[PDB]
Enzyme design. Sequence first.
Site, PDB file in Angstrom:
ATOM      1  N   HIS A   6       1.073  -1.273   0.128  1.00  0.00           N
ATOM      2  CA  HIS A   6       0.051   0.194  -0.238  1.00  0.00           C
ATOM      3  C   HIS A   6       0.885   1.119   0.354  1.00  0.00           C
ATOM      4  O   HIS A   6       0.747   1.920  -1.405  1.00  0.00           O
ATOM      5  CB  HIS A   6      -0.636  -0.258   1.510  1.00  0.00           C
ATOM      6  N   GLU A   7       1.839   1.171   0.665  1.00  0.00           N
ATOM      7  CA  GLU A   7       2.957   2.198   0.979  1.00  0.00           C
ATOM      8  C   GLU A   7       3.699   2.735  -0.271  1.00  0.00           C
ATOM      9  O   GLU A   7       3.942   3.483  -0.946  1.00  0.00           O
ATOM     10  CB  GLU A   7       3.670   2.514   1.893  1.00  0.00           C
ATOM     11  N   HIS A  54       1.271   4.561  -3.390  1.00  0.00           N
ATOM     12  CA  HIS A  54       0.944   5.259  -2.676  1.00  0.00           C
ATOM     13  C   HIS A  54       2.820   5.934  -3.752  1.00  0.00           C
ATOM     14  O   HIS A  54       2.513   7.583  -4.147  1.00  0.00           O
ATOM     15  CB  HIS A  54       1.231   6.138  -1.535  1.00  0.00           C
ATOM     16  N   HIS A  61      -5.912   6.432  -3.085  1.00  0.00           N
ATOM     17  CA  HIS A  61      -6.790   5.171  -2.347  1.00  0.00           C
ATOM     18  C   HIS A  61      -8.179   4.835  -3.079  1.00  0.00           C
ATOM     19  O   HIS A  61      -8.290   5.871  -4.041  1.00  0.00           O
ATOM     20  CB  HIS A  61      -7.652   5.930  -1.293  1.00  0.00           C
TER      21      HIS A  61
HETATM   22 ZN   LIG Z   1      -2.845   5.359   2.506  1.00  0.00          ZN
END
Ligand SMILES: [Zn+2]
Length: 199
Positions: A141-142, A145, A151
Amino acid sequence: ASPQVSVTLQLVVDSSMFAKYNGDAKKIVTVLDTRVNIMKSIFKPLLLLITLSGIEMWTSKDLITVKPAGDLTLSLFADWRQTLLLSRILNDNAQLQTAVDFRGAVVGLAFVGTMCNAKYSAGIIQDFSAIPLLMAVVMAHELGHNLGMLHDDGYSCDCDVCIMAPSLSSDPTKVFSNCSLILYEDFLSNEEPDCIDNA
Ligand SMILES: [Zn+2]
């Protein structure tokens, strides 16, 4: 979601996590490799190869002060990567793994759309679950980004249990939503991260 790319990822393990694992470097390595292997499966659909440039363990001392305030820790960590790590270990992104319990419910933090950037291609991860899948999803998830992903709009996107959901699901999928794929295509098109496209 199609040209063949590669991210040389450097992991960093702080003193708290080192201690949490009873100062066992072999145990820690095996744990992170299991997680990175799942991360590789998560990125496979995007034709993005994840390769570890290393796993640096701060066995003797923390090279930055790891604070419960995530925002502050990410800033400090990103700077340390810029000024100290990159002089020794070339890498496209570094991710701190720490046993420090960040304030609030935050278990990870990263700058958005900064992949390849000398000062901000970084992320931090709290070792909050012992389950490999849950930690790989957190790490992915990081990194997502960093790769320009926002999101998932849980209602609009074709998945409500995918990587970029705002909150980590209790039982997550390794899958990226259609929205996430479009954001990655935009990052490649608009931002043109040369370091993952090299030879
Ligand atoms: Zn996030």
